[model samples]
Target: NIENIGDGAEVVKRTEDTSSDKWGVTQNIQFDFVKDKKYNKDALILKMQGFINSKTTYYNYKNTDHIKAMRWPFQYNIGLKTNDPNVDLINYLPKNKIDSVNVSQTLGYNIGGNFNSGPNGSFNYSKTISYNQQNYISEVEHQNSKSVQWGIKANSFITSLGKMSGHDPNLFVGYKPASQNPRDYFVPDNELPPLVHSGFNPSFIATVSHEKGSGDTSEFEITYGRNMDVTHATRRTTNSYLEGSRIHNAFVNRNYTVKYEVNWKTHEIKVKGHN
Candidate 1:
């Protein structure tokens, strides 16, 4: 919410509740900014009377018959004291919820374990941490009045156009890249162009910036996900698929990602002059 005062998607609001539980279920972030009598704080005196409650739940289950469901909810109420002839009160809070449902029944170790395989189907989801911090660093000047901007582009076309045939593309040789920090979220191996930045370059670019626009506003969005591993053929023992070639070892090591960008003007000048 803009908090009545106003806002932007970036520079998130600092004062809010956005922590999540281990299950990955998170609560909605909500806090009010006192502006324009937003909560009607016009009067100082109050009769003093109000109450509220909060509730939350997250559920998940899978059935032997191949069925599943999940439910996650965060409910809360808010009330404030008011100077009234009778009683007094303040507010209420109710927001969106997220959940995931997964079902499995294929040979995939269903009921028992035999060289289980196939996908009865599975799913899991995550909630964005709406709660965040807000810190405005004012008036940092740009390099110059007019200059050339540069960046990378999506790498989607890269692999597709490579080999130029039905063949798939392999990682480029010269680009021996590596990743660090939260390496778990990234590939355990190398980093490359088509990252969430640049056209996702999946290409690097040198763009020229003109001074006549609103400002250099940029927005980038990237979503990456993978299919759940539903194969349960644990037969690779001294006499299984691997030992005796007993597995259908196919293309399970696969993933898909989407990245997009919207670049607006660099009104960077006027925005800095005053603040």
Candidate 2:
């Protein structure tokens, strides 16, 4: 027969609190190469890059009420790209057959909070995931020939958030199933589970921008959007009790942010306001 796992008279009793300590380190390496060629070109353009990173962390789960964690990380990236205009091929081909390809990479490191070893006890395991971003730009220009210029880029990263980091008042709805009763598992006078509605997902953001700022660059743009919500499931005979705690969920939450920027060359000033 199935037995209830709730903290009741029949559940296993805890004799004392236990503690544990954990530590670990991790390393990662990455590399990339790219090449491009044009018809009747004298030289082929090529680019190459390399990256490396490392991190270490420590954690002490002293007890249910007190837990602590610490971490540190480091990273580095190197990139190189060739510049060959193919100046000799201007007779048969168009002008400015090739311009220049600029490529660069950066390395960064961060240290903070609790650490845990991996399942295999490997030194390469890290409790905190590292993140990095890279980009490349190519520019081409010609005097009389048809000007052809465009660029492509991509970036991505990963990181970790400790327990209680994902809490948000605007996205979580916490409610016990109607079939279950809290009083059944607790003493008649004991307190019930505290209401705690929160969204515990880690934050992530990515964006790609493109512009044609060439030859008297002039352009216009327009954008429109909306927000909506839909029901996913429904239950019958829902119960409500003021004596019991209830966690309320919100689709949107109130927040504040600040931004500071300055332009030394153009002396342009701009400010943005939001709620």
Candidate 3:
């Protein structure tokens, strides 16, 4: 009955959920797997993925404050694991141990920010993120099956793509000094400087963790921010504002393809980034 799930053709259960608050919203998707007889009694485990999109917008139509600021960020994650390993809480019971199989492929769009401005300027940005997973087995087969990989791309106008992390193989992030800061989101058109910046290459890493048969996990993340601060010079003259703008329309449409493979039999996993 389990073999029928070949390439995800026969899905056991698929679920989707969306949550919203004052800050922003989060979207999630998950898949469950197991044999027919034990499907209801003892499902194997679940594979899941999520998207966290947050936005903050500030405006000074009257230009009274002469200073305005906002912060916006986005996050994504994927995880795979089993319920009971070598032990079933009581005794050793490795009944239907997974040998090797491909999990699932997921695709979705992460709309970053919409553009609307006053007399100052306008900025707009959006991005699409997706994931593809494959062959996973137990450690008894080979440890080489554990690993993850991803890629990123963005527009030059965006200020800075700062701190990023996951394993050597990881950024709750930070930014540079105010002098070089691009202040992309809130800069005025007249004061906009002639910015010239190059591109960056993706990163990679491999590591081992967990108690041999235990489940192991890793992550890769990037934070985006500006290099320059909003000076008083561009503040007073700027009337309108938006979350992601270009007048100082600071924006980046990063395209990414993330993938990870796991082996129940091994004690190691790797996460890689590619351009």
The lDDT leader among the candidates is 3
Query: Which portions of model 3 show Cα errors greater than 4 Å?
Result: 1-3, 6-11, 16-18, 34-51, 59-64, 74-275
In order, candidate lDDTs are 0.17, 0.17, 0.24
The deviation in Å at residue 58 for candidate 2 is 36
Model 2 residue 34 lDDT?
A: 9
Q: Report the C-alpha displacement of residue 272, candidate 2, in angstroms.
A: 1.4
Steric clashes per prediction = 27, 4, 21
lDDT of 3 by residue, 1-275 (tens): 22343222222434334333431323243323222321222222222234323232334324344333432222121212222233121111111222222212222111121111111332221112222111112121111223222222111122234322211000111122122233433433232112112111111111122233244332322211112211121232233322322222233232222233333333122323322
Q: Lowest lDDT 10-mer window, candidate 3?
A: 165-174
Rank by lDDT (best first): 3, 1, 2
TM-score, candidate number 1: 0.16
Prediction 1 global C-alpha lDDT: 0.17
Model 1 stretches with alpha carbons more than 4 Å out: 1-97, 100-215, 234-254, 265-275
TM-score of 2: 0.17
Of 1 and 2, which scores higher on TM-score? 2
Ranking of predictions according to TM-score: 3, 2, 1
